[PDB]
Amino acid sequence: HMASMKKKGSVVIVGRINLSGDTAYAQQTRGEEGCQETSQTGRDKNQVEGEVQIVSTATQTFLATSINGVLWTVYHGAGTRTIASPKGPVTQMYTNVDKDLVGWQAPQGSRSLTPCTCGSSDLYLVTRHADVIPVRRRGDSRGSLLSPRPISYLKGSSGGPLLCPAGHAVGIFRAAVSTRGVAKAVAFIPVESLETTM
Ligand SMILES: COc1ccc2nc(C)c(O[C@@H]3C[C@H]4C(=O)N[C@]5(C(=O)NS(=O)(=O)C6(C)CC6)C[C@H]5/C=C\CCCCC[C@H](NC(=O)OC5(C)CCCC5)C(=O)N4C3)nc2c1
């Protein structure tokens, strides 16, 4: 009934992948209980830093990546949800189910990656565990892992970046291509598709 209908909570930043120095590592900035309360209110006063955020809903956790002032992630993680911010929930600025893509204005204090113009095919995938995985580009939206590994290691990394050798954003991790549970390739949203959406 209408009186009882509930609202889905906001996506909440719960940590980040630190790429500042010479060592990549995940940092948690909010625990599960604070995440649930922040999802309900949409009010997140935590300071935000860096390019790759770890984000959560009540039921899922994944990544979000700032490129050109937009925090991008996958529709299969975020749906149409708002994101929590210091001033309350922020409505999506971009939503494209056909590309599995959504975006919000980048939070204050985040840093944005620059879209790649190098045309290079030697890529690097950044996971939620701060692994930097070499990936050879195989198409507009596909790349092969130089060292395959179980899909378990990639689960929760959708929304993370594929980067070129120079650290530019080449795409947003979308899906894993698996054979008997082993990931041999990945699918991603190319940054040009982001730049067109923009
Ligand atoms: C609901 O509206 C929409 C709209 C568009 C859409 N487009 C999609 C492409 C789409 O795929 C679905 C989600 C996505 C996914 O799991 N991604 C992540 C991830 O980490 N997720 S996550 O962070 O854990 C989570 C779950 C957000 C919290 C990186 C992969 C890590 C490990 C893989 C585990 C096994 C799943 C293998 C699937 N392989 C696959 O489909 O390969 C095809 C067949 C398609 C392309 C190459 C060949 C797969 O990867 N899948 C299925 N769902 C949608 C849903």
Ligand SMILES: [Zn+2]
């Ligand atoms: Zn580049």
